[PDB]
Every structure is written in C-alpha cells, then in structure tokens.
Curated annotation (Swiss-Prot), chain A:
Protein task: RuBisCO catalyzes two reactions: the carboxylation of D-ribulose 1,5-bisphosphate, the primary event in carbon dioxide fixation, as well as the oxidative fragmentation of the pentose substrate. Both reactions occur simultaneously and in competition at the same active site. Although the small subunit is not catalytic it is essential for maximal activity.
Known partners and oligomeric status: Heterohexadecamer of 8 large and 8 small subunits.
Family: Belongs to the RuBisCO small chain family.
Miscellaneous comment text of the record: NADPH and 6-phosphogluconate function as positive effectors to promote enzyme activation. The basic functional RuBisCO is composed of a large chain homodimer in a 'head-to-tail' conformation. In form I RuBisCO this homodimer is arranged in a barrel-like tetramer with the small subunits forming a tetrameric 'cap' on each end of the 'barrel'.
Keywords, in A-Z order: Calvin cycle, Carbon dioxide fixation, Chloroplast, Photorespiration, Photosynthesis, Plastid, Transit peptide
Location in or out of the cell: Plastid, Chloroplast
The UniProt record lists the keyword Amino-acid biosynthesis: no
Region listing for Interaction with large subunit, in residue ranges: 13-17
Gene Ontology molecular functions: ribulose-bisphosphate carboxylase activity
Shown stretch of the complete protein: 48 to 166 of 175
BP-aspect Gene Ontology terms: photorespiration; reductive pentose-phosphate cycle
S-S bridge residues: none
Organism domain of life: Eukaryota
Name of this protein: Ribulose bisphosphate carboxylase small subunit, chloroplastic 1
Curated annotation (Swiss-Prot), chains B, D:
UniProt remark on cofactor binding: Binds 1 Mg(2+) ion per subunit.
Matches recorded under PANTHER family: RIBULOSE BISPHOSPHATE CARBOXYLASE, RIBULOSE BISPHOSPHATE CARBOXYLASE LARGE CHAIN
Listed HAMAP family: RuBisCO_L_type1 (MF_01338)
An MF annotation (GO) of this entry: ribulose-bisphosphate carboxylase activity
EC number(s) per entry: 4.1.1.39
Keywords: Acetylation, Calvin cycle, Carbon dioxide fixation, Chloroplast, Disulfide bond, Lyase, Magnesium, Metal-binding, Monooxygenase, Oxidoreductase, Photorespiration, Photosynthesis, Plastid
Cofactor(s) named in the record: Mg(2+)
Species assigned in the record: Oryza sativa (Rice)
UniProt gene name: rbcL
Taxonomic lineage from the root: Eukaryota, Viridiplantae, Streptophyta, Embryophyta, Tracheophyta
Record Gene3D superfamilies: Ribulose bisphosphate carboxylase, large subunit, C-terminal domain, RuBisCO large subunit, N-terminal domain
Protein name: Ribulose bisphosphate carboxylase large chain
Swiss-Prot record, chain E:
Identification of the protein by name: Ribulose bisphosphate carboxylase large chain
Residues the record lists as N6-carboxylysine modifications: 42
Extra remark: The basic functional RuBisCO is composed of a large chain homodimer in a 'head-to-tail' conformation. In form I RuBisCO this homodimer is arranged in a barrel-like tetramer with the small subunits forming a tetrameric 'cap' on each end of the 'barrel'.
Similarity comment text for this entry: Belongs to the RuBisCO large chain family. Type I subfamily.
Positions annotated to bind substrate: 14, 18, 136
Natural source organism: Oryza sativa
Residues that hold Mg(2+) according to the record: 42, 44-45
Localization in the cell: Plastid, Chloroplast
Amino acid sequence: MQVWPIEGIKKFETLSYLPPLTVEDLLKQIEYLLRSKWVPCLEFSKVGFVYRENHRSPGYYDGRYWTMWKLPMFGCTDATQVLKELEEAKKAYPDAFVRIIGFDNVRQVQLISFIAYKP
Amino acid sequence: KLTYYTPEYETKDTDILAAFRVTPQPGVPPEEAGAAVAAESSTWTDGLTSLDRYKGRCYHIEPVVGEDNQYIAYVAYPLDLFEEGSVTNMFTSIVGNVFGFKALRALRLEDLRIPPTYSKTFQGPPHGIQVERDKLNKYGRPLLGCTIKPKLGLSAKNYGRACYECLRGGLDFTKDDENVNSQPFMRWRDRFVFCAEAIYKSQAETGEIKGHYLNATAGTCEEMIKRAVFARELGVPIVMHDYLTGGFTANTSLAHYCRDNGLLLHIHRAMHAVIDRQKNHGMHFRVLAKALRMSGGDHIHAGTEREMTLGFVDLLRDDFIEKDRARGIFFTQDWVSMPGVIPVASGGIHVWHMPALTEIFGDDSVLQFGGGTLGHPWGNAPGAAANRVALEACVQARNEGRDLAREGNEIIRSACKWSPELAAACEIWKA
Amino acid sequence: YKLTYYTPEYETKDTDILAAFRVTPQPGVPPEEAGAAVAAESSTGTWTTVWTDGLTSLDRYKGRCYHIEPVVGEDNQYIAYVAYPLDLFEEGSVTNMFTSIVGNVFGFKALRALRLEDLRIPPTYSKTFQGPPHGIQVERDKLNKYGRPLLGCTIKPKLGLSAKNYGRACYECLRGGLDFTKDDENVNSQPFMRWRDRFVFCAEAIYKSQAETGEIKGHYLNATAGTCEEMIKRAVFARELGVPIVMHDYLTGGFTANTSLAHYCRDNGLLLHIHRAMHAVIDRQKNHGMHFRVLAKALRMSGGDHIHAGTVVEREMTLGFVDLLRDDFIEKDRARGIFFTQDWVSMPGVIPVASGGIHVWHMPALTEIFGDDSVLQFGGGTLGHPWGNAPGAAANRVALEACVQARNEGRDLAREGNEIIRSACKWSPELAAACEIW
Amino acid sequence: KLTYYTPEYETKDTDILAAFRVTPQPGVPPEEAGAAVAAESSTWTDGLTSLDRYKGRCYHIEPVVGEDNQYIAYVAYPLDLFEEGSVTNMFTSIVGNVFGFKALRALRLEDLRIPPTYSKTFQGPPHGIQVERDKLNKYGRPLLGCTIKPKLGLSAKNYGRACYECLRGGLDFTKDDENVNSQPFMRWRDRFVFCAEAIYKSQAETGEIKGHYLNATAGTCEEMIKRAVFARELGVPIVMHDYLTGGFTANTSLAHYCRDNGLLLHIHRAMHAVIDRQKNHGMHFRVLAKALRMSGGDHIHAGTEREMTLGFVDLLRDDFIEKDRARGIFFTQDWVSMPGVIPVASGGIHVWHMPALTEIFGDDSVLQFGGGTLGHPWGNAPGAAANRVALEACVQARNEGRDLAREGNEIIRSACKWSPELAAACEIWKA
Amino acid sequence: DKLNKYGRPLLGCTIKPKLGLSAKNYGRACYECLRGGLDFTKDDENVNSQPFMRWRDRFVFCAEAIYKSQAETGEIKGHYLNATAGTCEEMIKRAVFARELGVPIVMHDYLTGGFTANTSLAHYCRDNGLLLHIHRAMHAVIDRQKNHGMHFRVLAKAL
C-alpha cells in the first residue's frame, strides 16, 4: 500500500496527472488542437494555483487567469511554431509556469488548458 | 376520427408538439385512439369561445414497426395553453389526464417539441456547460465525481473525511447521495461544515478547484432554500437537488436562487425509473431531461440502448438537434442559445470503463466513481488518483488520434506501468 | 448477497417503514434473489466493497426483504415485503421518503418490472408531518355543512374562458345548490386568463352566490405555479380576499412545494383542495409504477384537505384507499389493496373527491359507496343541464338530498336508487329535466 | 378506586407514562390516591366526546419499601393530550395541577416514559455529544471548564483576562456564571467582546480549539436571541442558557437558533434544587434532565446517591436505557437516535477528585474547576495546567488498565513528580 | 481622490466584440487591457445581460480581472459594469452585486433606462460609494438635427 503524496505534486488540471510530457508528446497535443481547428495560445504566471484573496462568494476565485503570452496563434498550421514560442517564454521567464490553452471560434469559448513548463 | 384527428394540420412554430406511443384497447382503431389522446389531453359555455383554438389535435399517426398494436400519435398543442416558465403546468397540461383514459390500454410520452417561443420564457440552467467550465477553470476532459458511501451511517465528520481524501487524489467533485438530506446522526448543517473544510483543504493541497454536491433536497421549499443559503455563505461552488422527488415547482425556485447567487446546481434524477423504464407506458427520460433543462440544472444524471442515450445527451447539451428516429429524437429541437446541461454518468463503473465512457460521452460529462473510488485497496486518495490517471491516459491517447474503442485496454495497461495506483485498481476490477 | 438482504425470519419493528413491492424478476432470477435485490438496491447495496463500511454498522441501515410470495397477478409476479429503518428518512419529508424507497430500485436490471403497492408509515415517522391543514371534521365545522356529501362542479371549457365569464359560470353553479366550483388542474395563469383576474371575479361569484342562498360557498382557486414564490403569492391573495379554499396539483407541482403550501394553508385558515394530475403516468399499469394508494398516503402526510380519488362508474380498491385517506386506523385487507395495518394516530383525514362521467342517476350509488364524507364533482353533469348551470346544480343537490333522506330512513340505495330518483323527479322539475336527457 | 384506577390497562407504545411518588393524606387508600393522581392530572359537554380516550389512568400502584405511607403510582397519558415539540405543554399537562390536590399530602414526579412517537416531534440537542466532539476535534478524555470568579465585581476586561489565562493553561472552556447575564459594571456585549479576544488568543497560543460559555439568559426572548446573534457574529463555538429560570419556551427557541447557526449550547440547571431536592415532593432531576434533552442543549450541569446520578447520566447520554429501579430508572427509555447531552460535573472539585470523576463519568463529560483553577497559588494558567495534567495522568492510567478507584492517589502523586504545577495544586488541596 | 489619480486624463477601453465573447474571455480581455496601463475597461452600452453572457457571470470574471491587474501594476483599476436593465429591480440587483464585489464603478444608459431609473441608481451609488459611468445611448435620436429636438447640452445638464 502506497500513500498519495501531500506535497510536491500540485496540479494544473488536464494532463497534469501524467508523467512530464516529452517534446514529441507535447507536439502531439498541439497537433490535436490544429487538427480540431482550435487556436493555440500560451499563458504564463509566477503563481501556479488558485487563491481567494478578493472574495469568497460561490464561483469566485483569484488565480484562474494567467498572463497571455503574445496573442492566440490564429491560422497556425505548424505545431513546431508553438514549441518555438514555448521556448521563447521559457527564456524570458524561466521562473514562470507556462501552459498551453486553446480557443474555438465556433462554440466561442476556451476549451483547452494543459501545463507545458514548470520552473 | 373526430374533431381531434386533423391529419393535414400544419404545425405552427409556436406549437408544443408531443409524440405519444399509444396502445389502444382491443377494438379501438388507431385513428380513434389518436384523436382521444389529443382530446383527453386538452378539450353551453362552449359557445362563449372558440374550442378549435384551444384543442390539441393529433395531426399524424404511424405504426411502431416490430410491435403489434403500437402507434406513435403526434399531437399539437397551441401556445396559449401553457403558463410561461412553468414546467409544472406543461406537464399538467400534456400528461395530467390522458394516461388514465380507458380507451388507451397503455400510453408513453416519447418526446416533446419545445418551441423557442415557449423555451424563452424559462431561465434554464443556472450556468450551463461553458460557464461551468470557465468558473472552475477545467478544460479538455470529463470531470470526475464520487458519491460518498455508505449513504447513511457515517458521522458528518467521517463523511467529510472521506470527501477530503477523494478530492485530494484527483477527483473534481464528491457527492451527497440522493437520499442524503438531513437525518438522525448526520444533520445537514453539520455535513455542510465538514464537507466545506474538506473542499478547501483538498483545493489548497492540489491547486485545483474542488466541489461537493451539497444536497439541498428538503421537505419544504423553505428548508430547501435555507440549505442553499448556507452553502452560499460557505462560498462553495455547487449544490444538488433531486428534481423529480422534490418537484418542478421547488426545482425552478432553487434554480433561480443558484442563478442569483453563482451556485452550480447538480441534478439527480431519483425515481425516474418509476416513470421511464417500461417501453409501453410512462414518459421517456428524454422528456424528463428536456424538462430539467428548462426548469434549471447544471448537471443531470444520465445513466451509463447506447443510441437512445446519445440521443438525449445531445438534447441536453446541444443548441440545435435535428430529428433522428434511430436515436429516439422524434422532433427537431431548437434551444435558441439556452445553455446545455452536463450529463453525469454513473452505475458500477471503474477504471476499465474509462476508454468507453470517454469515447461515448466526450469531454462534456461528469463520470461518477462511488465504489470505483472508495473500493480501492489503498484508500480514497489512491483510488481517485487511479481514476484521474486512467482518464487522462485515455484523453491523451484520444487527442493523439488513437482509437479508444479498440485500444482502450492497451491504453489502460500502458498507464499501469508507471502508476502504481492504477495498477492496484486494475488488479481488483477486471477488463 | 441473499442472506444479507433476504432475511425471512426478521420480525418487523414498530418503527420500521414497511413496503410491499410487486416484483417481476427477469427470467432465471429466483424469487429470493429478486427480493434481496429490491431491498439492497433501495438501501445499502454496493457493487464493490468499500472500507468506509468499517466506520459504522451497516446492518442498522439496510433494508430487509423479510417475505416474498407469488401473486396470482399475470406472469411471474411476486409480492416482496421490505422493512426500512426509521433513521433513514428525514422527518417531515415525503420527498425524502420517496427518494429513499423508490429513488433507485425501479431501474435495476435483474427486475423486469416493479410496482410499489403499499407502505406502512409508523407513528414515529407520521408524527413528524403536519398532515392535512384542517381535515374532514374541521372542514365540516368551518363550512357548517353536515350529513351529506359535498357537491362541486368543474368549470368548462377547461381553457379559453375569460376570467369574468369563468366567474359568471361559477356564480350560476354555486347559486343553484353546489358547495364548490373548481379551477381546472390546467388553469393556473395563461394568456387567455391571468390568475389574479380569475381570483377577483371568482371571489365576486363566491360572495354573490353565498349572499343569495345563505350557505357558505367556495371555489378551488388553483395556486399551482412554476415556482414556490409564485405559488405562495397566489395563496396570499386568496387569503386577502378571504375565500375558504385554494387548490394545488401536488404531483406536477411536487411534494416540496405542496408541503410548503399545506403549511401556509394551516397558518392562514385556508382549505386545500388537491388534484392528482399525472397520477396515471405512474399508477395505471399493474406491473410497474406506484399504486395510487401510495400517492394518496403521501398526500395525506404532505398535506391536503381534499384529494381527487377517481370514479366508480375498481370499486374495492378505491374503497381501500378511501379508508386509508379518511380513517384513523385501517386494518390489513389485501383484497382491497391494504397490505399493511395503518395507524394514523389522530392525523386528520382527507375528503375524497369523486369525479368522472357522474350524473344524477349515479347519486344513489355514490352516496351508498362513499357515504357522507366525500365531494361529488360534476362536469357536464351540471353544465350540460338543458336549463343552465343553476338548474343543473339544483338537480344535483335535489338528487343528492333525496338519496340522503332515503338512506336515513333505512332504504336500500343500491336497489331502490332509480325509484328514489324518479320519485324526486316528481316535485323537482329541475331534476326531471336532467333525467330526461341522461 | 374509580374510572381512573385501571390496574390491568396495557400501556400503548405511544402513551406518555409517569411514575409519581404519592403520599396520601391520612385515611386515603393508595388505590384512591392513585386514581386521584390520574384524574387530577387529566380529566353535559362530556356527552359530546369520549372521556376514556382522554383520561390519564393509574395502571399500577406499589408501595415504597422502607417508607411508610409512600407509594409509586404509574399513570398512562394518551398521546393526543400533548402539543408536538412543546416541553412546556408536557409539563403543563402532567404536573400543572395534581400537586395541589388536597387528598395528596405530598407528590413527587420521579420519572417519565417519553415514547419515540412523541420525542420525534422535538429537535433535541442542537448537536449532541458526538457532533460536539467532532466540531471541537477533542477525543478520549473529559473536557475541562472553569467558571470565572468572582461572579460579579470584575470589569468586562478583567473578566476576559481571567478567561485567557485559564484557557491557555489547558482548559477547554471558561464559563459565565449562571447569574452573569448583563449587569451594572459588566454589560453583556462588553463581556462578549473581551471573552472573544481571550478565546482566540488562547487558541492561537496553544493550537487547541477553545470556547467560553457566553450566557444568553435574558429577561425577554428578544434580548436572549440578540445575545446569541452577536456570539454568532464573533464566530465563537458555544453559548449558554439557564433553562429553568429562562423557561422552556425560551430554551426551545434558543436551541432552534443554535441548531440553525452551529452554536453549541451549554445548559445550566439553576433553581433545580427548588424542585428536586426533597424526596417526598417535587420532580426528580432525571425528569428535568429528560425535558432538557427534548427541549435542547449540548451540555447540562449534573452535579457531583452516586447510583441515582449514574442513572440520569445514562438517560442523558445513551440511546436506549433499560429500566433499573436500583438507579432510579422507572421506565425503559428509547430515544430513537436523538443525540445525547454531555453532563457537566461541578461542585468544589479539585485535582484530587480527578481519578474518581474520570472513572465515574467517563470521557463523555465536562469537569468544571472554578476555585480549583482560580485558587491555584501560581495563577490561572498554572492552575489549568495542573488540572489538565491530573486529568491526562488519570486517562493514561485508565487506558493502561489501571484501577483509578484504588490507584487514583498514587497516580496523582506520580504526576506530581514531573509537573510542578500539579505538585503546587496538591499541596494546598489534600487527598 | 478616491482613485488616487491626478494630473492626466483617465484612460478607458470598451471591450469588443460587444457580444459574442464568453464571460470569461470577456474578462480575460479586461485584465490584459488594465495591466497595460488603462484605468478602466468598459461594458458596451448594449451589454446588459444576454444569452451566452449573463450579467452575474460577467461581473465575476471582470472582478477577477480588476483585482489581478491592480495587484500587478499597483494602480487602482475599474470596469464600468453596466447595470442597465429592463426594470428598476433588476438594475438595483446588479448594482448590489457590484457593491458586494467591492469594485469602484458601475454604468447606466441614462436615456434608454430613463431618468426615473437613473436618479434611483444615482442615489444607490451615493449611498454605497460607487462611481457611476453614464453612457448617452440614443442621444442622436434627439440632438442631431439643428432644426428639431433637444441639444445635447440640455441632456447633459439633466444628467
């Protein structure tokens, strides 16, 4: 019997219970967005998790929004371009978390978010 | 045939349409049975108005292929018969009387065409699928829940203890059983307090937003609202209602409260099988599902034959659903931007069912693992981790282009190689 | 397993809630397994073991199938008796009682069909319920009406009347001798007639008819609504108008809303007429659902002063749940569908309301079958009178009172009914006209 | 004998049963006296009903052995006589009139069989023993309290100063004296403010949850609820009421408020000895204790002859209590899962009484040390530490299998060797 | 004085598209705008409560954007949360939640809402410390033609 850890495995929602993603596995997730006609975008933050500083009413949390890296990559067809921007963000903010998100113009929402880099 | 069988009537865009599965008594022609369904579910004082304006009319009858003495009767009800925003009155008007008519041996309401003109008088879901995902910051996978077992018998503290371990292992939600309201040995406010502590301890530990379906089902509307009020004070994200046993008048009141106060509303369909199980009599679940979307709810339990389920899943989630008899969709349903409801899958599922559930339902679903979490040999947190790992292994494989229908067992076995939690789960429950 | 949930030597406790299910197992499922499954899947059944069970004593929370036997009803049907511990149920909540007992078990795969036939509500549970806002005797005392069935009329056309023309029909029916007129179950608030306009004109009709005749009059004003707030708002205006009775569709409105309305009616002196709209969705088929006597017991607990109870034109089954609705103590009598001895420990009774195709010739049978503590509702039996609503009401009041007089004298209503009516036709031209067309 | 002496009447499971200790006047036979107790405590207009349905009946009479002219009369009252959920009406019905009957020289109500059918109409304790332990995270020992002395004469600030030192030394609770409500020189809101600061300072310092019985006893129900409301705003865990001097109508109202708002309710039995002291007349405390459990309270003062105390302690705490005349339990009492009330021991106790109190009462008790804490030569915090040390030394020894009845003094002397606080306490108070 | 801003015009930005964004994506745009140096973002005069973006959801996400941008920059931020509604009850309900969220400013379309409602909302904002941003939607129906109507200066004095 093994005890589930209490520290050091804080999470970032979808895919964060998998082992750290390789570059080829990261490319496959990015391609999934492109195949699905969704727009990839990068997001970064020095704070990795949600908190409740300004209010505690139902459905209010701080720390859900991170900061946008540049703009959503509209019309992107090359998944390696997303990787190039990921590496750029890692260079400018080596102590920041970076996740990859996705937007759909059809259902008009954000529908993807998975962690791409931890400092 | 009568003044109620009008086989060339052209439905109006404001009409509420109904598809009844009618089984006439011996010696009752289907034309006569269909006119009776329209009459018995609608209509000197008659000279003081125009009855043809207020009658339901059976505008089409067809046989059920493969069943003798079974027919589908289509009936059109004028818009003026229904009170705005009241599912209670829609049910009263359409199913309040006709199922007892002696000329009908059996009767089952299969579907309802809710016209946009009527549905726009309903608030609908307090939030719906897309708002809920944004509020909870969760994207790209089914959500995970777990009903606390035993139902009753635990202290309020031991109950919340189980919730914390479940949530900290990777589940998004834990759940009050539909039976858990307020009872001797676990009063509701005590449960709300300890479950609140479990919600926030697990959220601080993992970094992900957590919730617990706090059941507000009560004997009176006053008690029901009192329980939602305390959940609001505690700042938690979601409450719960048994909409069929509580009733539509109470459910619509609670849905209005949750909209006004930012609460997600998890809906359990307790007692539905009393009504929707038999093919020959009752009301199909898709009718009870449309009613819930109109009355208001953010989740609804949908079970776990597969084509019928996919049919009303689309009717619960999508904006526009084209007619499809193969999937039990008798009417084209236009919801004119009323938000959708997240279907909740439950029923003896475990890690090995994750490929099938992920492929069948897609991301916009909640998968509920009661015994599939609390039955893990290592406890609730490893059991949650096993379920969360199995799900994300399936999501990753689907996103990569893999076929969860033929590779599902291989995908689960592959994740067993690095997740001891999943490996232990897969050892007790078999493929 | 079987011996966890099939406990045939279990002795029921006086605090148990007992259920009698009519079970149709799937082919190959023996009766003892079907019985254990009904109890298990309506209590503590789990498909896999959970460690949390070690934190409690589950046997104190399980339902037990303590008896199962075949019934002469159709293919492969049995009656399974289940006992539920008192601690399972929230006090005062019909909603939780239904959820706890019928919430899940009807969908179990091994059960091809399932129907709840009866419930034994123990005094320890029924005492947590207010019950009827007033009940049979309080209602008779409030209305000053004794010694005969009460009389009502359903206003028709059901929909399409203006509020004022609705109240005009009500006044003419009431002034002729009927005690009540009735909002249709479908009549709530609609484009053809908004509820507050109806309440206003129906109140004028009530008081005009009462002042003309000198007898207390009422009209079931339907408070059924889409939200509990709208429902209470309609009850509040009826309270302001000072009228005696309001109305609720308890099944489509729901038990949570109905219990709230019953509490309001008790707090404000309003009688509560209850309609059973949508009951046949549930209670029609012999093989699956819930018999009406279960829904009738639940209404008496949640609260109502009248309840619609159907017609007699099967009788012994109807007489069974009439007794369950009216009496303080009802002995077990399965021939009338009474599977459990039911003790209501002084919870008031509900007046059953007979309705469906009833006209003047049926008055002897109705008075004999139901006795004085009933309401007899007429549809076309009043409005279809060739002389109008007031002569139609007079015909029904005359026919009823001639039946009551004859019964009081010791005459046999089941055999002398036609001659009692014909004899009354001689001095009531209103009744004669009704008997010429029906 | 009369229509009220029915010596073969079989009690109903819904009957309320009473055991009276009756002392008839000279020349009044016990059969006649017993019928009078039933009649005088119950029953042309008589022809409009059935009096035998509403009469109390004396179904059994027996002598009191060792007392001349004393008898126990057992009376059965039908369930319909009592208003649901009203201890006020139960007392009015049973003890409202009969104690003044001239044919009875003296009368004492000894016990009451509260049928489950009647007790289920009462909320009961706002929380009860098990909920309270879970809320406070305290297990495996009696709780410790201390009434602030002097009763009156301290400023509100100096009052709270004493509370802080007491709590920081190891006590779980401090206590408003039953007399302390609101008075010149210490108004209640000022006391609530300073006691709140003392509660949270001591809790932050020690890490254990602390409380203070903030007395809400008032002249009107409006004032009483106003004081509970501010305690709720301050977020403190427990308030207090003098249920006999405040009254049952007010106590039930306050108990409902504490249930709705998560407050523990400490109940003091002030003025009980006016009623329960004399063996020949009044009402035994066990009757007042059952009434409090029904009306509502989480603690109740129980005093510090020992068999009678153990009797009503079981009646306060346990779910099912079998008849036991040796311990004054005249009736089998089934509480059908109504929570129990923590008995509070008080009365000139100190560290040397810890073995006896721990063995006699067990863990589910509060031990109150007023002078036993404030009388310590080193102050309140060392006095609390002395009491907490003595208690845990007793608990440890009991858990190890030792006999606190014969080793208690040795256990206390042994703890003196390492706790200078206890040694100083044991020097001023002797074994 | 309330906003601690002196010596320059204030800067705002109406979120576009008007309608079509989710409440979350709407607030996402607000955060990026405010963190770059703007004092305010703005609900379009048309943005009240609509299918796909109900007002309370927008208020929640815009509140998160207000406080994230304020914590990041150190300057006080706001968003004109539009309280324009079909009834005065709905209008006040929306100002009440903005008050609970603790944000500095709300918004009203005073000509289309009407003066009776605007004066009621102005009284509420005075009682509760809220700044009131006023949009003049439909003014050109009245003030455009030189020969007929009411000049905007009259509508401005009235406001």
